[PDB]
């Protein structure tokens, strides 16, 4: 279940590995539009936080969840800032969200007295005055319940079929990164002159077994000249002395 667009949902994603290879390479998505970032470089990014916006809209409304957009959805249901950083992802959900009699459990705001600000949600049921006479909270002549249900049906043309749309919004520099993509490792090769990188510790040398005993906390050591003496491997905690290449 996705929220309706007016009843927008927001999941907070923190303290995790942001593996996006599952999303940017997905063939199930018709839209994968990244703003300020490249889809295939998402795994190289770090965020303070990622927020996931999860909701259902019509196919011709997919373009509205974007920076620079206006319209009933872009202005009354949900706005993205013009300088938005993140990716807008969408796919057809006609076989999930449409219902034969119309999936009218999903609604969008048709009436509002003003436009939304970026990341603002509006779930008010206040009766909108379209005309000149007061409504006093009651539906009637030129007085409306602000939400409009969607006639999502399996027989709708594509522009009227439901789409599941997810926006991954990127939060930076408010706090340290807690969300980072995955880091790809290689095989560990011993008794060769190599260019190495153990997590963040780099250099050139020959890796051989060490007779050192590190305290559980200590991952690598230092010689009297403060050069790297040995490095304990990140996957298996073996300590390897680093011999300079002759």
């Amino acid at each position, epitope marked *: 279940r996705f929220a309706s667009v007016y009843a927008w949902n927001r999941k907070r994603i923190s303290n995790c590995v942001a593996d996006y290879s599952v999303l940017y390479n997905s063939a199930s998505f018709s839209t994968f539009k990244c703003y300020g970032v490249s889809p295939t470089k998402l795994n190289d990014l770090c965020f303070t936080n990622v927020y996931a916006d999860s909701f259902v809209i019509r196919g011709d409304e997919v373009r509205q969840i974007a920076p620079g957009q206006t319209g009933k959805i872009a202005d009354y249901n949900y706005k993205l800032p013009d300088d938005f950083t993140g990716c807008v992802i969408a796919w057809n959900s006609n076989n999930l969200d449409s219902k034969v009699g119309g999936n009218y459990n999903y609604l969008y705001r*048709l*009436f509002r007295k003003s436009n939304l600000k970026p990341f603002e949600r509006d779930i008010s049921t206040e009766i909108y005055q*379209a*005309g*000149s*006479t007061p409504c006093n909270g009651v*539906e*009637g*002549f*030129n007085c*409306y319940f602000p939400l*409009q*249900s969607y006639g999502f049906q399996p027989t709708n043309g594509v522009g009227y079929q439901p789409y599941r749309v997810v926006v991954l919004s990127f939060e930076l520099l408010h706090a340290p990164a807690t969300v980072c993509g995955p880091k790809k490792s290689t095989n560990l090769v011993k008794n060769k002159c190599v260019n190495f990188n153990f997590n963040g510790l780099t250099g050139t040398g020959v890796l051989t077994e060490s007779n050192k005993k590190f305290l559980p906390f200590q991952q690598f050591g230092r010689d009297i000249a403060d050069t790297t003496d040995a490095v304990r491997d990140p996957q298996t905690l073996e300590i390897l002395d680093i011999t300079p290449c002759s």
Partner: antibody, heavy 122, light 101 residues
């Protein structure tokens, strides 16, 4: 912007009547259809109305619980059914239209066209 | 609902004379008042909309004014064909109607 109503019918008290009006195609995208009744020898009374662009219906209080108003978008036809009829319900049932703004939903209070009216005898 | 009263119930004029009709509502509708002219055998014909605006196809002899709860119809000079029953309509209700004879 024409409207053609069905002809007269005679009903037994306690039975229902379903009155229908056919609008020119395209009416439902820019107009709402309201129902007005006129008992013989009487003035006009408003019964209710449908807005095809909102799927909303408003009713006169005296007919709440007695009258159902709907429309068939594929046939440009407005419908009204009175569930249980009494002799005081004899009237000409008219359809008439009010334009509506599809962006703001501001509806007109006046009718720029009336059908000929359908007489239902009870 | 909005209770509407029209006054007088009947008028008696010669063709060529000026006539006005008064309408009062128990509730304000701002300017949302429609005036109709009904003749026997016909559905009511719109004369004026939004209290004072003349309807398309209606001759210049028809005019009007009003707001809120109090409205007036003016026929500057009645023609032999204007001895009709006039009605005041608001979005929810109608008045009883006034006959000009």
């Amino acid at each position: 912007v024409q409207l053609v109503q069905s002809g007269a019918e005679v009903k037994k008290p306690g039975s229902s009547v379903k009155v229908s009006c056919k609008a020119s195609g395209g009416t439902f995208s820019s107009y709402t259809i309201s129902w007005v009744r006129q008992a013989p020898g009487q003035g006009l009374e408003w019964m209710g109305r449908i807005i095809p662009i909102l799927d909303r219906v408003m009713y006169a209080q005296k007919f709440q619980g007695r009258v159902t108003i709907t429309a068939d978008k594929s046939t440009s036809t407005a419908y009204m059914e009175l569930s249980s009829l009494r002799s005081e319900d004899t009237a000409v049932y008219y359809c008439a239209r009010r334009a509506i703004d599809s962006d703001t939903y501001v509806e007109q209070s006046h009718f720029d066209y009336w059908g000929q009216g359908t007489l239902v005898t009870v | 609902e909005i209770v509407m009263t029209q006054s007088p119930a009947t008028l008696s004029l010669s063709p060529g004379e000026r006539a006005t009709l008064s309408c009062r509502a128990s509730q304000s509708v701002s300017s949302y008042l429609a005036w109709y002219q009904q003749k026997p055998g016909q559905a009511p014909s719109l004369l004026i909309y939004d209290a004072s605006n003349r309807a398309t196809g209606i001759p210049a002899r028809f005019s009007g004014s009003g707001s809120g709860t109090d409205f007036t119809l003016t026929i500057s000079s009645l023609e032999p064909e204007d001895f009709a029953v006039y009605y005041c309509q608001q979005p929810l209700t109608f008045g009883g109607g006034t006959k000009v004879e």
